[PDB]
Design a protein around this ligand. Structure first.
Ligand SMILES: Cn1cc(-c2ccc(=O)n(C)c2)c(COc2ccc(-c3cccc4c3ncn4C)cc2)n1
Ligand SMILES: [Mg+2]
Ligand SMILES: [Zn+2]
Length: 312
């Protein structure tokens, strides 16, 4: 277990250059990687390069690492390689727009953590100690790092190496949405009381934790026709899970039931109000430059309202 890339795959990636007409596009929060499948591993290399230059990773081990990650994502409609890269791009925009808050270690850890955060997702929920899927996705990240010529951190001291693995573990654990409700609440209080202090490691962990939810949910921050299409992918998976439950004579909850299709826009609306809006509001409060994520979220919420009210 742990599949690996071929030499053709890592060498082809080493040779890629992003077309000039995307370089301004890719800096924008709402950028959609969607139309550029061929370029996705290339796009990740690019973002690593912009954010730490052409000498932050041995370029060969880097391309090998990315191409093996890709081969350990499965061909599922939503929790796949497309979503890893989408989440990593959101993290890239955040780090670029907040350039001096984060250490060099943090920047490398979090881009890698984002690409690996759904490693070997099967297309079924946590429901079908806790943070099950996530402890596992971290486990798989550890295994790839450990292979052959795939250790991109080899050139760190053992003190830095232990540091970056622990950035990664906490980051991927933070992508379990059950834990997001409490982290956010904690952050909301600290901000209120004025007690938030980025010199404090456990405060940094929390902020980073929120940053991982915001990236993980970022398909709600793209332009309306892209968010709409992604929502179809999320449903392809949820309904396939609901179909497997009916196969056993089990009644799935409404969200996994394709017979409950007309209650889609209502469902979307509640999620936006209950999860997405508070997430990007607390983020915007701590990191003002992330404000365009909130704005794009608000715009998509009002699209969903108009669907419900019957006008699009
Ligand atoms: C980008 N993105 C990730 C996610 C996401 C991430 C983590 C997570 O745990 N969930 C559930 C979703 C989303 C929102 O997706 C949604 C899916 C279904 C609903 C829904 C709720 C209730 C009844 C419903 C619903 N749909 C049909 N009916 C009848 C809402 C939102 N967008
Ligand atoms: Mg996940
Ligand atoms: Zn995810």
């Amino acid at each position: 277990h742990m599949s690996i890339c071929t030499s053709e795959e890592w060498q082809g990636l080493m040779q890629f250059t992003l077309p000039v007409r995307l370089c301004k596009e890719i800096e924008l929060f709402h950028f959609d990687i969607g139309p550029f499948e061929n370029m996705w591993p290339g796009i990740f290399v690019y973002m690593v390069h912009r954010s730490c230059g052409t000498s932050c990773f041995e370029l060969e081990k880097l391309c090998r690492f990315i191409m093996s990650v890709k081969k350990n994502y499965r061909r599922v409609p939503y929790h796949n390689w497309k979503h890893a890269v989408t989440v990593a791009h959101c993290m890239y925009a955040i780090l670029q727009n907040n350039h001096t808050l984060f250490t060099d270690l943090e920047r490398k850890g979090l881009l890698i953590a984002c690409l690996c955060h759904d490693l070997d997702h099967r297309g079924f929920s946590n429901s079908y100690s806790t943070s099950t899927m996530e402890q596992h996705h971290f486990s798989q990240t550890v295994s790839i790092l450990q292979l052959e010529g795939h250790n991109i951190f080899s050139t760190l001291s053992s003190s830095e190496y232990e540091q970056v693995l622990e950035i990664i573990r906490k980051a991927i654990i933070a992508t379990d949405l059950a834990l997001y409700f409490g982290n956010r609440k904690q952050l909301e209080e600290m901000y209120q009381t004025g007690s938030l202090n980025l010199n404090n490691q456990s405060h940094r962990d929390r902020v980073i934790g929120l940053m991982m939810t915001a990236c993980d949910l970022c398909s709600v921050t793209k332009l309306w026709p892209v968010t709409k299409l992604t929502a179809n992918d999320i449903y392809a998976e949820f309904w396939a899970e609901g179909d497997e439950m009916k196969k056993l004579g089990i009644q799935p909850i409404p969200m996994m039931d394709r017979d409950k299709k007309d209650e889609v826009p209502q469902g979307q609306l509640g999620f936006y109000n209950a999860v997405a809006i508070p997430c990007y509001t607390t983020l915007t409060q701590i990191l003002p430059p992330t404000e365009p994520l909130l704005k794009a979220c608000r715009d998509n919420l009002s699209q969903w309202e108009k669907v419900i009210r019957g006008e699009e």
